[PDB]
Amino acid sequence: LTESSTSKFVKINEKGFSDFNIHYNEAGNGETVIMLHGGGPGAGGWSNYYRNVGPFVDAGYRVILKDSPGFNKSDAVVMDEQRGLVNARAVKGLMDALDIDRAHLVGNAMGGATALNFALEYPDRIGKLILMGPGGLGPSMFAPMPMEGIKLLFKLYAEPSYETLKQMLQVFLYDQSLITEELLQGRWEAIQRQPEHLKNFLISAQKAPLSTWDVTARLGEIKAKTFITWGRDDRFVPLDHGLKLLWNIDDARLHVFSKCGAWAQWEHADEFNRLVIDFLRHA
Template identity: 55%
Template sequence: MHAFQLLADEHQSLAAMLHAMHFTLKEIAAGRLSADAALLRAMAHYLTAYPQHCHHPREERLLFERLRARTDAGDAVLAELQAAHDASAEHGRTLLTALDAYLAGGDIHTLSAAFDQWADFYRGLMLREEQQLLPLLRAHLSADDWAAMDAEADPPSAEFTALFSRLVAAAPAPVGLGQGPYVEPAVTPSTVRSPVMSSSVSEAATSRFVRIREGDLDLQLHYHDCGQGAETVVMLHGSGPGASGWANFNRNIDPLVNAGYRVVLMDCPGWSKSDPIVCTGSRSELNARALKGLLDALAIDKAHILGNSMGGHSAVAFALAHPSRVGKLVLMGGGTGGPSQSVPMPTEGIKLLQALYREPTIDNLKKMMSVFVFDSSSLTEALFQTRLDNMLARRDHLENFVKSLAANPKQFTDYGPRLSEITAPALIIWGRDDRFVPLDIGLRLLWGLGNAQLHVFNRCGHWAQWEHAEVFNRLVRDFLRD
């Protein structure tokens, strides 16, 4: 039970840090210790960021999902624990806000009260997991389940392990070694984006869930969280049946992670493992609201947004609604709805896509994919079968897409008249042979956006990031860096 021991060790580490911060605040309040701002910030970061980005996603992926698959006896407990996981980000923001206020000259007792609320909340969460979840796991999971979890468990985060060690060294005795003040390790541009750094992320290890509440949206989103870095790149997938962030961008993640970026892939509502939804209004704006909810939940203030097809439409919708939260835009095969001036609408590819939603068969999938890319000879039977399996695993998504089209045939807003409002630098990438969204739509974007450049690939269809991955990755890295 290596995986379970890893999670138990994480509980112990978090409990130790709760105790250490409680002691430190008590000593400051009593006048026996001077405040070390860097130490307090690092402690609060560990207590709020480690659960959100490492511990909770690991529990949800290894324990929650597997228990749900084995029995419904734990549904009530899992719902309660999932709600607590989802609420932890807001609780964490309350603690961090109180810390900022104290370090700006506020009262230590106000910070201590905010910390006590966080500590009570989180100790209660860990206690419920140990007293309610553990018995269910022991009762319903087999030896094969535990072995599979051991195989799937990713190693502890090197970043947070190192942070914990630094905190133990700097924290006052007796909760630490008393070697403060706390000092962050030096970080240089070369260590943040060294070209010799190399890592490979996996689909399972980066899988995450989060509950978002944004306007009229209240749903669970699935996403992948890859790498670490001062800047974040969010990738938004297209609208094809069976699409997901990972399926769209698995050839593009490692190069950006190795360049020093955090990469987040959002599965839009109605796709992959995200909750189902019927969209009767603008799909572009629905996805933009979901993206805001995700960024808020992950405490990401600003991000570069890379969108393919529907993802491009959604990126533009987000940039119009929240311009201050966008760094740069990369738009491929999408960015605005509206008619093509050169090809009858709907296009050949869109007709085949809609037919596949209505009749999800291997033959219809092959028909669509034959015009999806320029050279379909690179598409294997295994790829077709995997995509079909993904589609059929979520028939509710297929049915809801058809219902959405019936309710509103124009799912994607024509942003042509508003493109000039966007000031973020934009890289537009298109396939000359795109039979889903023709090249003249890319030219409309180039004409309308105030700070844009266009790259057109020869012998390329609707999937530039997959068909020309190596050159595409280099273009995006250079654009984001400059």
């Protein structure tokens, strides 16, 4: 599978969205699993999940790697509401357009926020819920905020450079040897190709600060079976939030990977794939 061979576009129409272009990468034909990416400069579905798409398709799922609004090849947008919710509206728009009744969701960081908001807003449209270090769940009991990684994410949005990108990826990943030229060049291309996304993200963030994303009080509404993953060494979203989700969601479990930053699906892809596929099949 390649980005090119799996690349698709769909126009969505949900609430605020009118004829809004969503890019996604699709493979497989079984039960639908929609995978949702983080909010860093240059993020997108394919780059975030390229180590996961194959095994999930092999396991028999239909995998959709979605570009959230204002990222990668989806349309540009300035958001005045918290991104988790707006993003979830876009997932519903995509599912309606593609005639998908229910989907399992997988989301890291911003994508975890998207997935939480979707489960809250459209409980009849979700299967299982897989969350990797979801962002926006209020203060940490231990970590000073903004987190180290979030400071770098804002620095790169405001003053994009290849050097600052490398600095951000060094904080993002636990194992520095994973930062190949291929990874760097790829993310840098996505940043260079869509400068408007960077500008728009910063305007959006002013309009709706991270505090507005906090859906903690509503977590008791979630009836989806939930699998929470965390990197032990995540410098972007605090580990204690894994506990917050575990205590507040009715049917959840928590898996923490050692030697792992904020990209567990990439850093620990084999174990992540096995655990999540097992969860989807058997939980």
